[PDB]
Paper text:
The cellular retinoic acid-binding proteins CRABPI and CRABPII act as gatekeepers and facilitators for the passage of all-trans-retinoic acid (and related derivatives) through the cytoplasm to access retinoic acid receptors (RARs) in the nucleus. In this article, crystal structures are presented of the L29C mutant of [name] CRABPI in complex with naturally occurring fatty acids (1.64 Å resolution) and with the synthetic retinoid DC645 (2.41 Å resolution), and of CRABPII in complex with the ligands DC479 (1.80 Å resolution) and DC645 (1.71 Å resolution). The retinoic acid-binding ability of both CRABPI and CRABPII is centred on a hydrophobic pocket created by an orthogonal β-sheet fold and capped with a pair of antiparallel α-helices formed from residues 15–35 partway into the sequence. The pocket contains, at its most buried end, a trio of residues (Arg112, Arg132 and Tyr134 in CRABPI; Arg112, Arg133 and Tyr135 in CRABPII) that are responsible for binding to the carboxylic acid moiety of ATRA, usually in concert with a water molecule that is conserved in all structures with similarly binding ligands.
As part of crystal-screening efforts, we identified that an L29C mutation in [name] CRABPI allowed vastly improved crystallization and diffraction to atomic resolution, which was subsequently determined to be due to partial dimerization at the mutated surface residue. This mutation is found on the outer edge of the cap helices and as such does not affect the make-up of the hydrophobic binding site. The crystal structure resulting from molecular replacement contained unknown density in the ligand-binding sites of both independent monomers that was not suitable for fitting either ATRA or the synthetic ligands used for co-crystallization. It was determined that this density was most likely to represent fatty-acid byproducts from expression that were incorporated into the binding site based on their hydrophobic structure and carboxylic acid head group, and it was therefore fitted as the 14-carbon myristic acid (MYR) and the 13-carbon tridecanoic acid (TDA) in the two monomers. CRABPI shares high sequence similarity with other members of the fatty acid-binding protein family and so the incorporation of MYR/TDA molecules is a logical step for a protein produced recombinantly in E. coli in the absence of its natural ligand. Similarly, it has been shown that RXRs and other retinoid-binding proteins treat fatty acids (including myristic acid) as ligands, and so it is possible that nongenomic pathways are similarly influenced. To date, CRABPI had only been crystallized using the proteins from M. musculus and B. taurus. Whilst they are nearly identical, [name] CRABPI contains a single amino-acid shift from alanine to proline at position 86.
Residue numbers in the entry:
A (entry chain AAA): 1 to 137
B (entry chain BBB): 2 to 137
Write the structure that this text describes.
Amino acid sequence: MPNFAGTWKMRSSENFDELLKALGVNAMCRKVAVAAASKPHVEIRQDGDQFYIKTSTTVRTTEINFKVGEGFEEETVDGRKCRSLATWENENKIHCTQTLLEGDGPKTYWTRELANDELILTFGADDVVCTRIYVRE
Amino acid sequence: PNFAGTWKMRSSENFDELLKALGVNAMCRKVAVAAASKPHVEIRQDGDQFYIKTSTTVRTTEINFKVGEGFEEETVDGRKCRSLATWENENKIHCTQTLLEGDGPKTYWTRELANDELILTFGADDVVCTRIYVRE
Ligand SMILES: CCCCCCCCCCCCCC(=O)O
Ligand SMILES: CCCCCCCCCCCCC(=O)O
């Protein structure tokens, strides 16, 4: 029912450096990630529950393909392989639960919500929350 | 010796081990080693006065120094340091470093001209990384 599809550009970021610190990312990498990941561009294709999400920066591009309610594999923000499940949390919000394939680490998740035609991306690592707001371009 | 010119890296040794000695975690080392795999360097030199720009797609650094005079730069892992370059021989500059802030391994770099190749060495405690540059 909500239409996530389109091209998006990041307008604002809260607590990204703190999220990377909670994931144990070294400052050498955080310094580049915070500079470069200051202006990601996102493309979404959506057909009902079926999604394609591509996030690109000069430093790193990721693409995921998933159906809401079906398991898939992706990476955490710090690049660790995880098994994921996206659920509708409400009519305008996808909540994605994540479990590491290998090893131990903080509990991670992401959410994507459409609110007043803005795309709110939240990432969790234990009790740390990062909020990135995307707008249409 | 004429360090001036444009240079491209042909080989690297022990960069992963150097970043480990600097306390960089494995996931970060894998990305950093890849990101640093082929820097392009521009040097301008006028006697003892040096300008060194090192560029990669993800990160560019520039330093200006005179041999024998203190300056401030960053370690490889991006920690602010106070530095001093000296001639170790006719074709070799040795740069001693001290952290401005916090504690960490003893670091230094050397740049040497040998058979018109540019040999960059980084030290962190007893670990040595060697990077060899050739003229572009
Ligand atoms: C998220 C990406 C983090 C990337 C951090 C690596 C930064 C580039 C290192 C450049 C080292 C060049 C050393 C040299 O002068 O040969
Ligand atoms: C080991 C290095 C980990 C650092 C991660 C870099 C991430 C850069 C781009 C992330 C984009 C986040 C977003 O979707 O807004």
